[PDB]
């Protein structure tokens, strides 16, 4: 409610604490390209190129 | 002309036949290509307890 004259003022307070999770880093995998695509094969180095 | 039509197995697994092929010492855990009755594979072969 309100009219030409009114206002609300707090009388007491209350300290509060709240968490805020935040990702920072992610475990980084090191995946190569040849083996995965092609293992040890004679034609591996010719058709790959 | 004898036109009798015959048909062998069409893409079936090994059976009671065994072609004229020799044998050699098996591979336990070597990271090499292997041959056991035609099937060929590469990579690393590791033994499990399944
Ligand atoms: C704290 O808040 C209560 C109501 O929750 C109030 O009665 C009290 O007056 C407040 N503290 C002080 C010092 O006034």
Curated annotation (Swiss-Prot), chain A:
<comment type="function">
    <text>Precursor of the fusion protein processed in the biosynthesis of the S protein and the formation of virus particle. Mediates fusion of the virion and cellular membranes by functioning as a class I viral fusion protein. Contains two viral fusion peptides that are unmasked after cleavage. The S2/S2' cleavage occurs during virus entry at the cell membrane by host TMPRSS2 or during endocytosis by host CSTL.</text>
</comment>
<feature type="disulfide bond">
    <location>
        <begin position="38"/>
        <end position="44"/>
    </location>
</feature>
<protein>
    <recommendedName>
        <fullName>Spike protein S2</fullName>
    </recommendedName>
</protein>
<feature type="glycosylation site" description="N-linked (GlcNAc...) (hybrid) asparagine; by host">
    <location>
        <position position="12"/>
    </location>
</feature>
<feature type="glycosylation site" description="N-linked (GlcNAc...) (high mannose) asparagine; by host">
    <location>
        <position position="4"/>
    </location>
</feature>
UniProtKB/Swiss-Prot annotation, chain B:
<feature type="region of interest" description="Disordered">
    <location>
        <begin position="12"/>
        <end position="34"/>
    </location>
</feature>
<comment type="subunit">
    <text>Binds to host ACE2. RBD also interacts with the N-linked glycan on 'Asn-90' of ACE2. Cleavage of S generates a polybasic C-terminal sequence on S1 that binds to host Neuropilin-1 (NRP1) and Neuropilin-2 (NRP2) receptors. Interacts with host integrin alpha-5/beta-1 (ITGA5:ITGB1) and with ACE2 in complex with integrin alpha-5/beta-1 (ITGA5:ITGB1). May interact via cytoplasmic c-terminus with M protein. May interact (via N-terminus) with host bilirubin and biliverdin, thereby preventing antibody binding to the SARS-CoV-2 spike NTD via an allosteric mechanism.</text>
</comment>
<comment type="function">
    <text>Attaches the virion to the cell membrane by interacting with host receptor, initiating the infection. The major receptor is host ACE2. When S2/S2' has been cleaved, binding to the receptor triggers direct fusion at the cell membrane. When S2/S2' has not been cleaved, binding to the receptor results in internalization of the virus by endocytosis using host TFRC and GRM2 and leading to fusion of the virion membrane with the host endosomal membrane. Alternatively, may use NRP1/NRP2 and integrin as entry receptors.</text>
</comment>
<protein>
    <recommendedName>
        <fullName>Spike protein S1</fullName>
    </recommendedName>
</protein>
């Amino acid at each position: 409610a309100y009219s030409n004259n009114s206002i609300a003022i707090p009388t007491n307070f209350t300290i509060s604490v709240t968490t805020e999770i935040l990702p920072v880093s992610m475990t980084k995998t090191s995946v190569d390209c040849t083996m995965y695509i092609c293992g040890d094969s004679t034609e591996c180095s010719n058709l790959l190129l | 002309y004898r036109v009798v039509v015959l048909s062998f197995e069409l893409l079936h697994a090994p059976a009671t036949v065994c072609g004229p092929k020799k044998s050699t010492n098996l591979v336990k855990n070597k990271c090499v290509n292997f041959n056991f009755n035609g099937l060929t594979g590469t990579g690393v072969l590791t033994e499990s307890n399944k």
